[PDB]
Homo-oligomer: 90 residues x 3
Amino acid sequence: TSLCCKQCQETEITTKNEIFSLSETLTVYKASNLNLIGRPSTVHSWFPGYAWTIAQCKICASHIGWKFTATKKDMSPQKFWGLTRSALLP
Amino acid sequence: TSLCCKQCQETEITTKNEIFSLSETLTVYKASNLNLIGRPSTVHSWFPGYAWTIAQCKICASHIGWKFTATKKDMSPQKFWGLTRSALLPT
Amino acid sequence: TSLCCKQCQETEITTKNEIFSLSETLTVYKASNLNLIGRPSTVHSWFPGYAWTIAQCKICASHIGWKFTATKKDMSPQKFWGLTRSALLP
Ligand SMILES: Nc1cccc2c1C(=O)N([C@H]1CCC(=O)NC1=O)C2=O
Ligand SMILES: Nc1cccc2c1C(=O)N([C@H]1CCC(=O)NC1=O)C2=O
Ligand SMILES: Nc1cccc2c1C(=O)N([C@H]1CCC(=O)NC1=O)C2=O
Ligand SMILES: [Zn+2]
Ligand SMILES: [Zn+2]
Ligand SMILES: [Zn+2]
């Protein structure tokens, strides 16, 4: 089930069990081993109602995707990860 | 694994991966594409120690279930979803 | 998929769907029916950057594992559980 950082190979980022459908970019409820770079922005957000924060592998700093955070409290999930599929192995 | 709103058929509300057993009403750790109506209440809560908030499909406003939030910090999960099985497709 | 408290048998603590790899002790994103005892500590933490809180079964008080809580905001997950495998069935 593991989806690992493609660059450093060994580092698990998420699992297929975390995949969900909100409507290239995999959306998952939970992820691991990522560092958040900077502050959320809503500029060009692919998911209306959410802001994005760059997320990179904590081991090799590969840009894997973004943490998406809801701007309104009545939305669900309040946060998820949108991950570039080609930056993950399997 | 997708569990969709029975009414609008398009909208995924949770997945079989998210099901867990707290103890008609499916309980899941995580859900999607729900709007929360109102503020939490504990009155007649089906899960003692948790407050509920009505949760409806964001597309068709069909009442799918409730978001349950823990009233005490030492409980696990601190939040979950109780979904009406008859309001979702697959079974 | 259910992993139940071995002692009281009937209480589910987590499911295989919740297992992930942060790298005897199973790590899962989500768990249920556990009571937390005391306050977080980083003393001897098995997971640098996380503090631990003892977690016991809400029904039989068997010690199942620990809740791990991030000491910094930019970590993912912000929390998880580490559960003693021999304290669970399947
Ligand atoms: N490569 C660049 C370069 C400039 C601006 C953006 C990107 C980029 O990937 N995104 C994403 C961030 C994530 C998102 O939701 N929408 C975007 O357009 C930008 O805003
Ligand atoms: N249809 C009605 C009408 C009045 C009050 C409630 C309901 C209802 O479904 N619940 C639920 C909310 C969720 C819960 O935990 N227990 C309930 O009885 C009510 O409190
Ligand atoms: N049985 C004892 C006795 C004293 C201290 C600890 C333990 C114990 O199991 N842990 C764990 C807590 C969880 C952890 O992260 N590291 C540990 O060493 C202790 O700190
Ligand atoms: Zn990496
Ligand atoms: Zn709907
Ligand atoms: Zn037990």
